[PDB]
Design an enzyme around this catalytic site. Structure first.
Site, PDB file in Angstrom:
ATOM      1  N   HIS A  53       0.815  -1.209   0.000  1.00 49.06           N
ATOM      2  CA  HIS A  53       0.000   0.000   0.000  1.00 49.06           C
ATOM      3  C   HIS A  53       0.852   1.264   0.000  1.00 49.06           C
ATOM      4  CE1 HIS A  53      -3.235  -2.642   0.132  1.00 49.06           C
ATOM      5  NE2 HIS A  53      -3.853  -2.282   1.242  1.00 49.06           N
ATOM      6  N   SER A  81      -0.973  -0.882  -6.168  1.00 45.63           N
ATOM      7  CA  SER A  81      -0.800  -1.962  -7.123  1.00 45.63           C
ATOM      8  C   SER A  81      -0.173  -1.476  -8.425  1.00 45.63           C
ATOM      9  CB  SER A  81      -2.139  -2.631  -7.433  1.00 45.63           C
ATOM     10  OG  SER A  81      -2.630  -3.348  -6.316  1.00 45.63           O
ATOM     11  N   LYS A 102     -15.349  -7.483  -7.465  1.00 43.17           N
ATOM     12  CA  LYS A 102     -14.551  -8.320  -8.356  1.00 43.17           C
ATOM     13  C   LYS A 102     -13.829  -9.427  -7.589  1.00 43.17           C
ATOM     14  CE  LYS A 102     -11.307  -8.033 -12.188  1.00 43.17           C
ATOM     15  NZ  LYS A 102     -10.458  -7.168 -13.045  1.00 43.17           N
ATOM     16  N   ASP A 103     -13.296  -9.112  -6.402  1.00 45.02           N
ATOM     17  CA  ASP A 103     -12.641 -10.116  -5.575  1.00 45.02           C
ATOM     18  C   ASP A 103     -13.640 -11.124  -5.023  1.00 45.02           C
ATOM     19  OD1 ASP A 103     -10.252  -8.849  -6.095  1.00 45.02           O
ATOM     20  OD2 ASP A 103      -9.922  -8.129  -4.055  1.00 45.02           O
ATOM     21  N   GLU A 129       4.292 -33.893  -2.572  1.00 41.12           N
ATOM     22  CA  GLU A 129       3.091 -33.370  -3.171  1.00 41.12           C
ATOM     23  C   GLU A 129       3.414 -32.674  -4.486  1.00 41.12           C
ATOM     24  OE1 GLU A 129       1.658 -35.359  -1.619  1.00 41.12           O
ATOM     25  OE2 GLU A 129      -0.159 -34.269  -1.083  1.00 41.12           O
TER      26      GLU A 129
HETATM   27  C1  HEM Z   1       0.681 -15.686   2.034  1.00 37.42           C
HETATM   28  C2  HEM Z   1       0.486 -15.598   0.724  1.00 37.42           C
HETATM   29  C3  HEM Z   1       0.273 -14.292   0.073  1.00 37.42           C
HETATM   30  C4  HEM Z   1      -0.773 -13.441   0.261  1.00 37.42           C
HETATM   31  C5  HEM Z   1      -1.952 -13.631   1.183  1.00 37.42           C
HETATM   32  C6  HEM Z   1      -0.549 -12.320  -0.575  1.00 37.42           C
HETATM   33  C7  HEM Z   1      -1.456 -11.260  -0.621  1.00 37.42           C
HETATM   34  C8  HEM Z   1      -1.350 -10.260  -1.561  1.00 37.42           C
HETATM   35  C9  HEM Z   1      -2.382  -9.369  -1.902  1.00 37.42           C
HETATM   36  C10 HEM Z   1      -3.764  -9.341  -1.300  1.00 37.42           C
HETATM   37  C11 HEM Z   1      -1.909  -8.543  -2.867  1.00 37.42           C
HETATM   38  C12 HEM Z   1      -2.668  -7.421  -3.528  1.00 37.42           C
HETATM   39  C13 HEM Z   1      -3.589  -7.941  -4.631  1.00 37.42           C
HETATM   40  C14 HEM Z   1      -2.805  -8.425  -5.822  1.00 37.42           C
HETATM   41  O1  HEM Z   1      -2.145  -7.631  -6.521  1.00 37.42           O
HETATM   42  O2  HEM Z   1      -2.821  -9.631  -6.125  1.00 37.42           O
HETATM   43  C15 HEM Z   1      -0.576  -8.916  -3.130  1.00 37.42           C
HETATM   44  C16 HEM Z   1       0.231  -8.287  -4.048  1.00 37.42           C
HETATM   45  C17 HEM Z   1       1.524  -8.729  -4.284  1.00 37.42           C
HETATM   46  N1  HEM Z   1       2.131  -9.832  -3.814  1.00 37.42           N
HETATM   47 FE1  HEM Z   1       1.376 -11.085  -2.643  1.00 37.42          FE
HETATM   48  N2  HEM Z   1       0.589 -12.475  -1.266  1.00 37.42           N
HETATM   49  C18 HEM Z   1       1.156 -13.644  -0.926  1.00 37.42           C
HETATM   50  C19 HEM Z   1       2.342 -14.221  -1.385  1.00 37.42           C
HETATM   51  C20 HEM Z   1       3.200 -13.577  -2.270  1.00 37.42           C
HETATM   52  C21 HEM Z   1       4.278 -14.166  -2.945  1.00 37.42           C
HETATM   53  C22 HEM Z   1       4.704 -15.607  -2.819  1.00 37.42           C
HETATM   54  C23 HEM Z   1       4.869 -13.185  -3.730  1.00 37.42           C
HETATM   55  C24 HEM Z   1       6.038 -13.323  -4.627  1.00 37.42           C
HETATM   56  C25 HEM Z   1       7.245 -13.671  -4.194  1.00 37.42           C
HETATM   57  C26 HEM Z   1       4.122 -11.996  -3.524  1.00 37.42           C
HETATM   58  C27 HEM Z   1       4.384 -10.792  -4.122  1.00 37.42           C
HETATM   59  C28 HEM Z   1       3.378  -9.846  -4.308  1.00 37.42           C
HETATM   60  C29 HEM Z   1       3.590  -8.687  -5.175  1.00 37.42           C
HETATM   61  C30 HEM Z   1       4.853  -8.352  -5.925  1.00 37.42           C
HETATM   62  C31 HEM Z   1       2.443  -7.989  -5.153  1.00 37.42           C
HETATM   63  C32 HEM Z   1       2.143  -6.712  -5.892  1.00 37.42           C
HETATM   64  C33 HEM Z   1       1.609  -7.107  -7.267  1.00 37.42           C
HETATM   65  C34 HEM Z   1       1.222  -5.922  -8.108  1.00 37.42           C
HETATM   66  O3  HEM Z   1       0.632  -4.947  -7.603  1.00 37.42           O
HETATM   67  O4  HEM Z   1       1.480  -5.928  -9.330  1.00 37.42           O
HETATM   68  N3  HEM Z   1       3.101 -12.270  -2.654  1.00 37.42           N
HETATM   69  N4  HEM Z   1      -0.249  -9.985  -2.330  1.00 37.42           N
END
Ligand code: HEM
Ligand code: CDL
Ligand code: CDL
Ligand code: CDL
Ligand code: PC1
Ligand code: 3PE
Ligand code: 3PE
Ligand code: HEM
Ligand code: HEM
Ligand code: HEM
Ligand code: FES
Lengths: 239, 110, 74, 379, 52, 56, 379, 54
Positions: G201, G205, G227-228, G271
């Site tokens: 934040h 995004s 949408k979500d 798995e």
């Molecule tokens: C516990 C698991 C995870 C949760 C709950 C989580 C949750 C979120 C959420 C809610 C967002 C904002 C919505 C979206 O853009 O999809 C987000 C964005 C992001 N997450 Fe995750 N995430 C997780 C794991 C990861 C992993 C494994 C990575 C990569 C190594 C990661 C990297 C990012 C990045 C880079 C963004 C920004 C994407 C963008 O705005 O283009 N996250 N995450």
């Protein structure tokens, strides 16, 4: 109805930093093995627990090897008896609780691994019970197979007096008077309830010295930081 | 400055002692408990095992085979070729003390 | 709520000393003991009395309980 | 071009909560018991987790697993009795924390006080469910009595109790679910303590005079980090005296006996930090009124702001309110003693008058006395 | 991170902080040896090795 | 003086301060365990297993 | 007057995170998988806690406890296979989420990308330790192979493997501590996800064009909450198709056999969501080199921002790097398939070429190809 | 003493062998598996069991 509570005895382990007498622990194991074990279990103590406490490893191994223990099914699927081993727990005198009560007049002799911790009064209570048998006082009648113990709640115990003079022979020649036997077994039972007793007290001594260093020095640290506030002076100079 | 920082450094030494003891205890709790260290950990055998006899045991949950392969068998399994085997192994290499091969007793197939 | 925007203060002067210039336990006993006694005297007639009454209630309750289990000639 | 401590988004909030937070220059030792509680929580989560590495919640193994921890796990008795006496230290600190709040009018911070009431209830639920885990006689029969207290609820009470049990009585289902709830609840408590501090930092701390102190604020770090650390060292000293010199002082011997559903202990007393409420619940003969009084004896903390009639926030300058406060403390000690005693001739009447005094001080005597103090000050 | 940091002032910074860095590395080594009771090394410290 | 020299050499630099603490902590664990163990074995002389094992 | 949604300290945080958050107006369905991940997490905490109400971690009862959950607990089969297929859905969503980050250059958000790597590791550890809990054949022998992999570590491998076991092999102590870690870890994952969203934040995004979207931000609430919600309903559809129509599609029959340390299964595979790594490690003959490759295949995600050599952020306007991205996805699919297969001809050379190609793409081909694209655009 | 009683609804299906070793002794070294999960614990399920039996 009021109850008779055990007096306080000057156990050599009573003191705050005082350990158990491990010779009394050894004699107490001898008492348990030769007296109590016919009717009491010690499920949570194994022969390996005795090593470095009251017996050497060779001695405790021979103590384990003195008994026979039932081992898991063989190729044919039959159980069998093998000599005891250090990792074996103390044998149980009865196959199930019901046979235990059957061998008595219906009473369960408790497991003794925790009996000192599981009673109010502890070793004092157990010494009082073992030494406190007397004929009931006028007006008191007990059923068959009950015995008057003024320290047992209700004063009617199903256990007959187990210890008497020369009930066992001690390997150090210690005369086996009833009170000697009771003191030894109560020491062993305190150990069985708390095998960490000596280590806990050594750690307590170390904690007391570390605290008697740290608390003054951290207090000095706080007062060094706070002296700036505790000595500052304020002046009000309105127009 | 020396008096004040001497107080601080002695404080740190005592705190480090206490922290090492606490963290060591918590690490050691995850280390094998006394029952684990006294069960299958070790099982010394005895001379009860006769010549060419599979006196069997139950160590590590695994049935243990203890035999006394008498000369010939050892030599025969040296005579048993290595390349012919599916799992290439040498008899003397398998049995460090030729006279007695000790194999955990369980079939390696289902 | 951060330093610099808490309140308006005027005409107040603070004098302070470095901790490395002053002692950490000055007059700790000659002055600390009289202050401890002053504070004790200031609070004791408000703190102690209810705990005195509790000690009395506990003593009486325990004693009366143990007298109610005694034998009566009846 | 910036200090990381103030610019970095995580370091920003750590800095604002524990380093550069303006704290009153004159908060006393009674203000240490917040950090102590946060430390106690942490300790309970640490030891507990290491306990959870060996505990098994089946009814055939729970008592045995605890015995295994205390006899075979390397330094397992240290962790076990640290956990057991850290729960008692947690409740000592909680009672002192709430007593401080009452004495200095801290409840006037409505949101943090209400979060604190929630935290009190959750810590009590956690400790209650955890005490059943050893599966001793006291564990089993205390769970029995306090769960059966829920049948007094009209209409839906029995179904609620049987649903919490997972069966007809306290048994295997109850033990495993209590282990699960006991594992998860302290993390909910951690989140609630974080929200608690979030609400507190909106105003900062109250102080013993009850007067706003923005003209005399000091940074948290050098002063109250070291003060809180020394308080933590003292708490550790008391806890370690308990653990290493009298491990069983605050416990019952009968929990070293395995649970026996066919043999009720002659006494069934809950933990000492429930006894006051226990005494309150045993004062009134009616089942449902007894339960309502037990819940009210904690829900009444939510009434402190509405019952505040004094012109002054704190009781520093209120001698008669201090008198009543220490009567309330002595009455709570009386209720703890009475709840530890059998229901017999002297103790019944003592507990009844103690419960009436408990409610009559908070609801009646304290507001009237504050009004009298107002008039004595000509306001 | 390739050659923006490659210069005379940066080699001076490196030399200035090398004694502090090496002292911190010795601090880390001693702390690691003491925390783990690494007998391999500790068997050489004159009086400390009495623990073993 | 002794404490002035102590500060000048071992305390002024933070990395040398930390090294002094690490070496001191090593030698303190040794000495304090040795002394406290001797105290505890003198308080309980003749009772501990070490005290009586030499006959079995 | 105020809007309490904007003024209240808790509601202010909620408002800034999910209501009044400015979000790009063009983020695609691929930006849904964040909200799916956090939903999966919640589902795993919900069903697992209800599994933990009946499950027992003693090796004499764990497999039986799970059979009891699925056979006698009311709707316990629902909770159990919802939990298992929700772990599979968690990993599907994680892989799609990381693939989106790679494709659109979301790793240029350094802090939230690095926290995401931490989250990937922690979810993997949680799923691994959870799969041992049923104590089936695959549970036991997968734990055996994966934990004995750590013996490859120089000088401390055996000591650390035995310390993790708490014994000479995978046994009772390992199962109980794995239950404890499996319970605690998802809550640490929750905290890390909160930190993750805090770091995200800070910038908001990224979008599919890779261009900053501040001139076209829309409020989160009406648009991306709905949408979500639609994305969550679609995810629930897939999850329930798995749970109710092929419960055992993504699992292994040998875990319906209780663990037999005497007999090993003919095939010991993790798995499915581990197979790509299990292939890479199995490609290298050297034990330690294999473990290092199995770790580098996930640590290499930390290198993506330093490997970025394009003038553009996302892959939307770079056909050649899209080609390489889809080759990377195909190579990951072939690594998964290879890891599900025996170590024999021809899967060995195929796994070797795939394992080489994965690193050759990420570390070499993708940077050089971005540079070529840069020059084709004359910058 | 342990006794023999008629079975009940709450009773599980009787076991043919007291322990695995008696099962293996009765079946030429082979332990016949528990069939509560035999369909689930095999690749091919009831198809496999049908083809095996026939
Ligand atoms: C516990 C698991 C995870 C949760 C709950 C989580 C949750 C979120 C959420 C809610 C967002 C904002 C919505 C979206 O853009 O999809 C987000 C964005 C992001 N997450 Fe995750 N995430 C997780 C794991 C990861 C992993 C494994 C990575 C990569 C190594 C990661 C990297 C990012 C990045 C880079 C963004 C920004 C994407 C963008 O705005 O283009 N996250 N995450
Ligand atoms: C139960 C659960 C566990 C609870 C844990 C503890 C929680 C509270 C922790 C509070 C804390 O860390 O510091 C508070 C508190 C702050 O005291 P302070 O910084 O000295 O301020 C004193 C006032 O200025 C007032 O100073 P004064 O006017 O009394 O005179 C100076 C001074 C010295 O004079 C006296 O105390 C007289 C002593 C005669 C003997 O007073 C004190 O030191 C009072 C405390 C004495 C102990 O610390 C203490 O009360 C001292 C702790 C004991 C010393 C360290 C160990 C030796
Ligand atoms: C001589 C024996 C009797 C002493 C006089 C007792 C009495 O009647 O009035 C106590 C005298 C009069 O109290 P005050 O100065 O009007 O108000 C004290 C402030 O509320 C609080 O002022 P403070 O925060 O400067 O008080 C620090 C004080 C009190 O610390 C605490 O009360 C916190 C720790 C839990 C309670 C410990 C009770 C023992 O610490 C100690 O006295 C014990 C030092 C070691 C524990 C760590 C601090 O207060 C004290 O000496 C502290 C009371 C508790 C310790 C005794
Ligand atoms: C007609 C030919 C066969 C069907 C389309 C084949 C194809 O490659 O279409 C790509 C084409 C998308 O190309 P694009 O617009 O460059 O991709 C933008 C993103 O896909 C994002 O576009 P979006 O946010 O509007 O959502 C579309 C997205 C939705 O993806 C998801 O919801 C996640 C799917 C994986 C889980 O799915 C796809 O684009 C790929 C197909 C997913 C499975 C069907 O798919 C569509 O036009 C939407 C789906 C139409 C299905 C009929
Ligand atoms: C590398 C850092 C030292 C690790 C280590 O083995 O410390 C020695 C100590 C004690 O070992 P030691 O010093 O008796 O001998 C070390 C030799 N090995 C490693 C084969 C045991 O190790 C431990 O306490 C635990 C292992 C390291 C955990 C990190
Ligand atoms: C014996 C019990 C402990 C007594 C400790 C000393 C004491 O209570 O002294 C009175 C003290 C004075 O504190 P002060 O803020 O100065 O109040 C104005 C006084 N004119 O009053 C206080 O410090 C009261 C602070 C209350 C702290 C919690 C106590 C209630 C919880 C009990 C469980
Ligand atoms: C997916 C199948 C559909 C597909 O590939 O659609 C292509 C489409 C193009 O999307 P666009 O953002 O317009 O890219 C520029 C196109 N000229 O969409 C895309 O290219 C977007 C796909 C990449 C980003 C979303 C996440 C995809 C994850 C795929 C699996 C990843 C597995 C783990 C990888 C690490
Ligand atoms: C989970 C247990 C709890 C923790 C960790 C906790 C933590 C804290 C901390 C760290 C503080 C600031 C330091 C202090 O003044 O003590 C504080 C203050 C406070 N807490 Fe608690 N607390 C807990 C339970 C409670 C309870 C049960 C209440 C009572 C309803 C409560 C009400 C308050 C109030 C009113 C304050 C402000 C006191 C003042 O500034 O005067 N808290 N808490
Ligand atoms: C709010 C913090 C906590 C409190 C107040 C608390 C309190 C208690 C209490 C009173 C007991 C019974 C102690 C006894 O045997 O006499 C107990 C037992 C136990 N607790 Fe906790 N606990 C807390 C946190 C945790 C957590 C987070 C876990 C799990 C990670 C845990 C795991 C256990 C286990 C396994 C037992 C059973 C073994 C034992 O009796 O010591 N505890 N807890
Ligand atoms: C990060 C989220 C989580 C993931 C990815 C996860 C993953 C898994 C997996 C894959 C299994 C094996 C399922 C199977 O039998 O095939 C499992 C089992 C289990 N998990 Fe979790 N889990 C998570 C959270 C939790 C939590 C928070 C708890 C406890 C509150 C929990 C309790 C359990 C229990 C009791 C089992 C054994 C029952 C069973 O096998 O179905 N899980 N977990
Ligand atoms: S290996 Fe023994 S059965 Fe084929």
């Amino acid at each position: 109805d009021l109850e008779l509570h055990a007096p306080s005895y000057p156990w050599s382990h009573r003191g705050l930093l005082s350990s158990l007498d491990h010779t009394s622990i050894r004699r107490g194991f001898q008492v348990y093995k030769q007296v109590c074990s016919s009717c009491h279990s010690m499920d949570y103590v194994a022969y390996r627990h005795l090593v470095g406490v009251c017996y050497t490893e060779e001695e405790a191994k021979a103590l384990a090897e003195e008994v026979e223990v039932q081992d898991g099914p063989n190729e044919d699927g039959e159980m069998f008896m093998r000599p005891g081993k250090l990792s074996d727990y103390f044998p149980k005198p009865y196959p199930n609780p019901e046979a235990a009560r059957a061998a008595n007049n219906g009473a369960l002799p408790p497991d003794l691994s925790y009996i000192v911790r599981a009673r109010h009064g502890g070793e004092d209570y157990v010494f009082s019970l073992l030494t406190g048998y007397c004929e009931p006082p006028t007006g008191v009648s007990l059923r068959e197979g009950l015995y008057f113990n003024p320290y047992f709640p209700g004063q009617a115990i199903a256990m007959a007096p187990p210890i008497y003079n020369e009930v066992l022979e001690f390997d150090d020649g210690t005369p086996a008077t009833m009170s000697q036997v009771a003191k030894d077994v109560c020491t062993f039972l305190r150990w069985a309830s708390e095998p960490e007793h000596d280590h806990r007290k050594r750690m307590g001594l170390k904690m007391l010295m570390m605290m008697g260093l740290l608390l003054p020095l951290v207090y000095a640290m706080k007062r060094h930081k706070w002296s700036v506030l505790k000595s500052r002076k304020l002046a009000y100079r309105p127009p | 400055k020396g008096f004040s920082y001497l107080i601080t450094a002695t404080t740190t030494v005592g705190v480090a002692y206490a922290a090492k003891n606490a963290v060591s205890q918590f690490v050691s709790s995850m280390s094998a408990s006394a029952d684990v260290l006294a069960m299958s950990k070790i099982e010394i055998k005895l001379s009860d095992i006769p010549e060419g006899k599979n006196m069997a045991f139950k160590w590590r949950g695994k049935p243990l085979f203890v035999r006394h392969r008498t000369k010939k068998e050892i030599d025969q399994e040296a005579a048993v070729e290595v390349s012919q085997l599916r799992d290439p192994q040498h008899d003397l290499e398998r049995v460090k003390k030729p006279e007695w091969v000790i194999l955990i007793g369980v079939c390696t197939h289902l | 709520r951060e330093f610099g925007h808490l309140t308006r203060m005027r005409h107040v002067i603070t004098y302070s000393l470095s901790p490395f210039e002053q002692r950490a336990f000055p007059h700790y006993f000659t002055k600390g003991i009289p202050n401890v006694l002053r504070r004790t005297r200031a609070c004791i007639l408000r703190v102690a009395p209810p705990f005195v009454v509790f000690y009395l209630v506990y003593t009486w309750g325990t004693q009366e309980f143990e007298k109610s289990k005694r034998k009566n000639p009846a | 071009m910036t200090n990381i401590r103030k610019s970095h988004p995580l370091m920003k909030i750590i800095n604002n909560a524990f380093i550069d937070l303006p704290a009153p220059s004159n908060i006393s030792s009674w203000w240490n018991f917040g950090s102590l509680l946060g430390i106690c929580l942490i300790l309970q989560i640490l030891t507990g987790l290491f306990l959870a590495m060996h505990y098994t919640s089946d009814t055939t193994t729970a008592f045995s697993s605890v015995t295994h921890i205390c006899r075979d796990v390397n330094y397992g008795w240290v962790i076990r009795y640290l956990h057991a006496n850290g729960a008692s230290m947690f409740f000592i600190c909680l009672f002192i924390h709430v007593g401080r709040g009452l004495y200095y009018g801290s409840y006037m911070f409505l949101e943090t006080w209400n979060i604190g009431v929630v935290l009190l209830f959750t810590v009590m639920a956690t400790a209650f469910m955890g005490y059943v885990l050893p599966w001793g006689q006291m564990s089993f029969w205390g769970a029995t009595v306090i769960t059966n207290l829920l049948s007094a609820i009209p209409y839906i009470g029995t179904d609620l109790v049987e649903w919490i049990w997972g069966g007809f009585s306290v048994d295997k289902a109850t033990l495993t679910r209590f282990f699960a709830f006991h594992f998860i609840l302290p993390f909910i408590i951690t989140a609630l303590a974080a929200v608690h501090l979030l609400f507190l930092h909106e105003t900062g701390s109250n102080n013993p005079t009850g007067i706003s102190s923005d003209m005399d604020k000091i940074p948290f770090h050098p002063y109250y980090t070291i003060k809180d650390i020394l308080g933590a060292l003292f708490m550790m000293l008391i806890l370690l005296i308990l653990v290493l010199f009298s491990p069983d002082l605050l416990g019952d011997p009968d929990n070293y006996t395995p649970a026996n559903p066919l043999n009720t202990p002659p006494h069934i007393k809950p933990e000492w930090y429930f006894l006051f409420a226990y005494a309150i619940l045993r004062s009134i003969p009616n089942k449902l009124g007894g339960v309502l009084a037990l819940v009210a004896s904690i829900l009444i903390l939510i009434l402190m702001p509405m019952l505040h009639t004094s012109k002054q926030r704190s009781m520093m300058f209120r001698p008669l309110s201090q008198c009543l406060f220490w009567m309330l403390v002595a009455d709570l000690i009386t209720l703890t003693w009475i709840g530890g005693q059998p229901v017999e001739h002297p103790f019944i009447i003592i507990g009844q008058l103690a419960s009436i005094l408990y409610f009559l001080i908070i609801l009646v005597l304290m507001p009237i006395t504050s009004i009298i103090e107002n008039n004595l000050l000509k306001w | 991170m390739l050659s923006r940091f490659l210069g005379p002032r940066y080699r001076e910074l490196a030399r200035n902080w090398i004694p502090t860095a090496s002292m911190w590395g010795a601090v880390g080594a001693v702390g690691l040896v003491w925390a783990t009771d690494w007998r391999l090394i500790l068997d050489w410290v004159p009086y400390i090795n009495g623990k073993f | 003086t002794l404490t002035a020299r102590l500060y000048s050499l071992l305390f002024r630099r933070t990395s040398t301060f930390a090294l002094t603490i690490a070496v001191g902590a090593l030698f303190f664990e040794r000495a304090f365990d040795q002394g406290a163990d001797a105290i505890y074995e003198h308080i309980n002389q003749g009772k501990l297993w070490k005290h009586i094992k030499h006959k079995y």
